[PDB]
Amino acid sequence: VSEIKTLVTFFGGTGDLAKRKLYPSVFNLYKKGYLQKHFAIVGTARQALNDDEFKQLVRDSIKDFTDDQAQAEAFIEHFSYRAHDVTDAASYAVLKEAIEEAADKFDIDGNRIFYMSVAPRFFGTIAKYLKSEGLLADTGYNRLMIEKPFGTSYDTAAELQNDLENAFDDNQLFRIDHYLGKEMVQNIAALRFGNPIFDAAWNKDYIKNVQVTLSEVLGVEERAGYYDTAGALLDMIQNHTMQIVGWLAMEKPESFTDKDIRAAKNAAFNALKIYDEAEVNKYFVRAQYGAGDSADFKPYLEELDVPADSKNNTFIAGELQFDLPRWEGVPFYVRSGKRLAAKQTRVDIVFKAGTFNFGSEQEACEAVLSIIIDPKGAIELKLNAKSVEDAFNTRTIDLGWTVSDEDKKNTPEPYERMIHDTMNGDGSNFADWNGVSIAWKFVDAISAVYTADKAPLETYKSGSMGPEASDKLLAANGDAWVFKG
Amino acid sequence: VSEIKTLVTFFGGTGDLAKRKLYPSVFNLYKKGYLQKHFAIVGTARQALNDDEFKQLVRDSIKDFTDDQAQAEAFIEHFSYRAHDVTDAASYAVLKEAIEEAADKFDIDGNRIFYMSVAPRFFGTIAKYLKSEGLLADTGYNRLMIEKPFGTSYDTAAELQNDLENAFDDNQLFRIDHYLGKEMVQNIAALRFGNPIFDAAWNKDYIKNVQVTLSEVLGVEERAGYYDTAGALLDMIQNHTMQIVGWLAMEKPESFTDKDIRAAKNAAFNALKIYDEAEVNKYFVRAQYGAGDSADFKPYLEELDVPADSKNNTFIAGELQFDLPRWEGVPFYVRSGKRLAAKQTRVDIVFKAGTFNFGSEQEACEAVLSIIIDPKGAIELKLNAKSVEDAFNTRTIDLGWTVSDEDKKNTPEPYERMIHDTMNGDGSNFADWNGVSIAWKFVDAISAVYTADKAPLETYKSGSMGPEASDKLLAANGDAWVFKG
């Protein structure tokens, strides 16, 4: 396999994410032979540790992924550390020095990746100092990996983007969204464009509606502190759901290059309808989970640290509309919520029923293409066939495929994939500025109605798939949620 | 369920087919409540039996399908018999009498079905006498069920048709072909017309080639006496294969009525290309099985009662061409043979690979829709998806569906279905004159080249899928057999 020559700096190197997810992911790239001799990893945080102590931290982090002791040690030898406060400009001179020493020791010409595994408030600060204090390489590339979230409204995101653009171009920004790094999400484009029978049918003349579900069975848990201010709207819709929808609604690209894929996705995003107060009440539904059918399934307001006057949404369902010729009249239904009937991330594409008359009692129903992303990768195609009756009649049958154990074994973790894509300079599995800003504009419009309490807050029994208003939404267009639980 | 009022006469009533297949099939229709009070079954043959003895014959025939003794006896009470020689005109007066007595006893107004379970040489004779001797009902319908074969060449079939048309119209003729009475064969039209994504793709712009396989693992066995003069050509191709192809190549009908289905099938049959000597050598392959990989798999010439100078075909493979806009440039490959790798009756529809460039090492292959009819009903769709690799690449995955045990339990035997369809007057699962005559014209053209030895006779190892010439045939158009064994 070909060698990747790169120098990666991990801000928040002693963090939980760094030791649980980042280091093991990088180790994997080394095991596969992508990282060989010309690469270095510089960790940093305020904690005063020397190179040996940091190496031991990394050693303990990759412990459970070690087979060959020699292999582990050869990898660990590529790490170095430097204590540093991100708010102290002068202190950046010390980190600059460590970076240059590492590049010398391992002979790396530029090719720097900066990973921000720190609190969101530091994002803009760090980027500006990388530029002003001279940490950016003058050779090769310079890429920034920004952890979530990327803003909390269009305004803040716009501000962050502005600060980031001081030192980087948008094509150098890699916003983390682990859902886009999921293997099955990447199968959408393959199924669509790789098969003419689907490619030709991916439009208003064959599709009736598209449904995206991101259900969870757990509740707010110990995360009340954050969740109460975010809700399903900011925690699941704005980011994960919107980006999955981007893959589904995109135009057919000129080629499969990241640049062309983004242009095709943006054509869709730019045609998305932004709702006013009236439209929000008509096309969206917000809810909060009530009691379950036992006692441990307590209502959201009775959860720990939840203000008894919280009107936070633990569920969102809504209809999206694209003003593009291929999607004219095709609603895109989305829904995500806590304490629902099942944990599942799926896409259901409902095809219009055919008008051929068999003269049978039961006529042709709608065919459905389902792509289950979580918990296990699956693809199902519900088609119309002949029923086993004496008289000719139709029925639906399901053609299915499931990921094999061998498949599961070879599938890279989402973080490995994302770091690897960044080293490659491949932006196809990453949201760009345009897609993110539009996602924010769309969501802000809804938020405004919610914080101003200009829309009802619904309730639903824990364990159900949501309030009846969710079904009322689809019924208005003669549609129904495919996944019932 | 609604009651069927009918009087059925079984010529060859004491025959093997009558007691093994016919009577139990009719009994089933009674168990389901289709046959109630107004129906009678008149059996006939030369053997001198009285009504009691025939009833006992029927009793022993349905023995293994009895649960309720009372039910069995109520059914048996509807049977009567009359000794009769089909070559003796005068003797028909005696059968006429028995038929009219049965109609009185059970109050049946016309609605007569005559089943010919006798030797083929009697077919024309029986029909002519039914007319001249007055056995046809003057009220209701009169339908004739002709067992196989329907001729041995276009000439003989044309002669038989002429004799049959003395007393019946073609719409009253029901030619038996148990393959058309198979549940899965009837699922073709449902899959195609019931699903717009397939309906719209069932033409030259999406399909590369269609393949029909009717393989068997057994050899000529004890059937040398008949087989040696027929071959795979007359035994499997002319009848079974041609009619399955009819379902596949038909135009889209105006409605799903038997009349419209036949008109749509005939549009295809009429556009079928009849081959000359040159084309036969170029588009067809005849072979005979050689030795296997043990000793019990002896060559065809070493089979019992096989003339050491036999050039009989135990395998046929060929390309069919339809001169219709929807099939322009689309070859239909067919193959059937003995001592092949596996017993299987299937249809494989190869879709043209897409031209979208992923920039991957492995580009999009051809999608395949497979319909397995025998031994177990199955439907598979091979599609292009993303491979589980670090770099984006494509692979094919299989979406499958299999008939459930409950399905198998409810599926009517082919004979039950055929008799039931005849009582209903439904000709959709039956070949009409036009389809049969064209099938004969097509086959005769090939036969002529074979009996005149103007084409090579190939050889193949028992257990293989046929001679290499079979593969050479598809390779000429850049195609390959999907089912490898």
Ligand SMILES: NC(=O)c1ccc[n+]([C@@H]2O[C@H](COP(=O)([O-])OP(=O)(O)OC[C@H]3O[C@@H](n4cnc5c(N)ncnc54)[C@H](OP(=O)(O)O)[C@@H]3O)[C@@H](O)[C@H]2O)c1
């Ligand atoms: N872990 C998860 O599962 C997860 C999942 C999704 C998203 N994320 C995101 O990843 C980022 C951090 O996650 P985490 O779980 O790893 O958090 P964490 O345990 O709190 O780690 C914070 C890191 O930042 C360092 N730090 C604090 N203040 C600093 C400063 N003033 N200057 C320099 N370094 C400073 C800390 O080291 P010192 O205290 O020694 O300075 C520590 O290494 C956040 O953006 C979070 O949203 C995490």
Ligand SMILES: NC(=O)c1ccc[n+]([C@@H]2O[C@H](COP(=O)([O-])OP(=O)(O)OC[C@H]3O[C@@H](n4cnc5c(N)ncnc54)[C@H](OP(=O)(O)O)[C@@H]3O)[C@@H](O)[C@H]2O)c1
């Ligand atoms: N059984 C199978 O699996 C099978 C499968 C496919 C097709 N078929 C077709 O079904 C037909 C017969 O099959 P089979 O297996 O049932 O044969 P079979 O046992 O030979 O029966 C022949 C019947 O014809 C009667 N018969 C003979 N000569 C007659 C005459 N001169 N007048 C009146 N009746 C006469 C016989 O009764 P008498 O001798 O007492 O007159 C007997 O009942 C054939 O066309 C065959 O091709 C059979």
